[PDB]
Scaffold this active site. Sequence first.
Site, mmCIF file in Angstrom:
data_model
loop_
_atom_site.group_PDB
_atom_site.id
_atom_site.type_symbol
_atom_site.label_atom_id
_atom_site.label_comp_id
_atom_site.label_asym_id
_atom_site.label_seq_id
_atom_site.Cartn_x
_atom_site.Cartn_y
_atom_site.Cartn_z
ATOM 1 C CB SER C 267 -0.935 -0.007 1.205
ATOM 2 O OG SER C 267 -1.702 1.181 1.252
ATOM 3 C CG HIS C 295 -3.908 -2.817 -0.390
ATOM 4 N ND1 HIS C 295 -4.673 -1.673 -0.397
ATOM 5 C CD2 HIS C 295 -3.316 -2.867 0.826
ATOM 6 C CE1 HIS C 295 -4.554 -1.059 0.766
ATOM 7 N NE2 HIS C 295 -3.737 -1.764 1.526
ATOM 8 C CE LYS C 327 -6.919 -2.556 3.307
ATOM 9 N NZ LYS C 327 -6.819 -3.856 4.021
#
Lengths: 62, 44, 492, 153
Positions: C267, C295, C327
């Site tokens: 990230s 992610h 997410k």
Amino acid sequence: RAWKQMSWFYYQYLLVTALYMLEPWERTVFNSMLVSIVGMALYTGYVFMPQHIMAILHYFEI
Amino acid sequence: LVEMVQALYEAPAYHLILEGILILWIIRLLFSKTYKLQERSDLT
Amino acid sequence: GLYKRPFNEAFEETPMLVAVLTYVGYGVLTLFGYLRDFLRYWRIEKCHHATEREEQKDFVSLYQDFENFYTRNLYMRIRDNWNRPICSVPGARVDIMERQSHDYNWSFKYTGNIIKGVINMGSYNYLGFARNTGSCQEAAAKVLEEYGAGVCSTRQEIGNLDKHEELEELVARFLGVEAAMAYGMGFATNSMNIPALVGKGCLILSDELNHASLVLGARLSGATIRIFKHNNMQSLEKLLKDAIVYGQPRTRRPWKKILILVEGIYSMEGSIVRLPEVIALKKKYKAYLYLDEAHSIGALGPTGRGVVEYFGLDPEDVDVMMGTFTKSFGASGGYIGGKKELIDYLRTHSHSAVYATSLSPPVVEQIITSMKCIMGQDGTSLGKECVQQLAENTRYFRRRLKEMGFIIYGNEDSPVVPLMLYMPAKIGAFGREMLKRNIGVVVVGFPATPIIESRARFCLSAAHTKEILDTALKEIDEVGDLLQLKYSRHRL
Amino acid sequence: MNVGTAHSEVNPNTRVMNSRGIWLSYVLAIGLLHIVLLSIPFVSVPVVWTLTNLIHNMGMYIFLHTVKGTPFETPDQGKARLLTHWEQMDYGVQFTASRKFLTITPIVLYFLTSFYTKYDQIHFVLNTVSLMSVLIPKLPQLHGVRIFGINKY
């Protein structure tokens, strides 16, 4: 116009020297120490060192 | 260089010996290629 | 391993003058922090903090003062860039409750006004599933009405439901693996399942930028941990060779197991793992692969299946595929996918399976509906438009910021854009200036990062229209002119 | 912010000296100290140089060999709670480019200040005491040992 430019330069000085996040009295302390050192250095340079740099500044002004 | 040589000659003997051993120490650090980790373990 | 498509990434080095000025700022801050600590110690300036109760003055002090240094002197000065409350759904535009401080962020007072329509670049909704009106909301409402909210037992006990079995089978179908398991927290997944797989006598090879959950899970188990450089296949290969050859540290013996912990998309850095090389290395050296895919499970891939689809690889090659629903899918939880034997061993010997309360029914219904929409079970054209829009937005935003003179980290495909600030004061300055123009961003400072790189993270979304991106880009250009944040030498 | 947000390393304090431009900043700080010392009007050159040496060595000793621990919460549960910065550097690896640089620079400063002091004996003994006070802790043998139990806890 020029005042805006000087204010912008002061803002950049604050950002670079991290004075932006300090409180006003800490800014006062740092600025006072800085100007004292610069003035003392100029005094020493004038008294002891020859005014060759002063001649260069005068030539640049002319 | 000649002025530097004269200035060095103006120095006392013990000062120059100390500077020389310091330079030898610097050489030893520069060529201390071994990167010891400072550990020691033994079996039980 | 070979790539079917070019793999472009860029991490430009810091200009030397910028590094020097960064060190100047940090030194000034440290000196003034020491001065303030000296003033506070001698009671010359009254301390605005809570103290221990008078009845416990003779106890040993609870904390160590020096550990709070950076908290008292650096974090507290720019504390208002974090913990900003919101009173709306975290969509493309969010409403932020306004607060002010009169004692330099030591206490916050709440004003009545509410900032409205702030462009959201801090939330994690990649595919724009964070909505208060839709089909998923109605399904969640129906399941909330039927099942209630929250279960009051454990999976191995009476707390196992039919919704959980449906979710697990649907997840197994979505990933392509044989079986999968679902848990109620992404952090807990790692922290409670890594200790089950490995133990004392095994080796864990962890990347340089792993999440805190992976590190905590590796520490809880008794295995040995060795760290290799971020996306450095040479370092990984060297560590693998040394581990296989030289054996255990004290009593030289063959390792019982070797596990490699990696992530899909990192990230903060913004990079994508070199999965083909890692797979080739683990096949050559007979190692096991743990892939954190929080992610990338929705952001990456032509159909949004993750990194393995992005590289066009075989899901059966990765031993453990963990992921998080927070997410992309817009609901809490986590999952682990793999072969049937692994899933059975986890169902039997997992900390969260035995001691922890399972998921909530509305949450699992929302996950099920979102993932059915993504895979196209409903038949509506939605679920492909989201992925295509996310890809276009990422490409457009990254190109536009790179051609403006900024420094940006990571691949050209990752929907996470780390802009580089490099100085401690510019962190707070950027946060405040961007909030003043109705853009919400996230800023990261020194102790989290290396010292010279402090950054601001932009999280793009499929719900961001083109006009929103254009407005954000023009405001970013204005602020970059104001703060001189265009350090890039290659293009400007 | 919190340690571990953008880097898995438990103790960032062990890398601050391996960063980019840190050596240049150190040298520039020494130079600026020398300049502001020359700025004083009524002090002679050898006195200025010995003050530069003494002040730099005292500050270096205070920062590297006196302050122990970390200025921030760390997720290894305070493993380095008692170690000083010189001991934390590079996770105990005794020789490294940063350690070599930090050990060499006071010796070069000592050579320069001995040349500029005209080898006076008083300045010799002062600068030698200061140089020993800095260089003795740098020895690999003198790792993790506190004499007479001073600064132990």
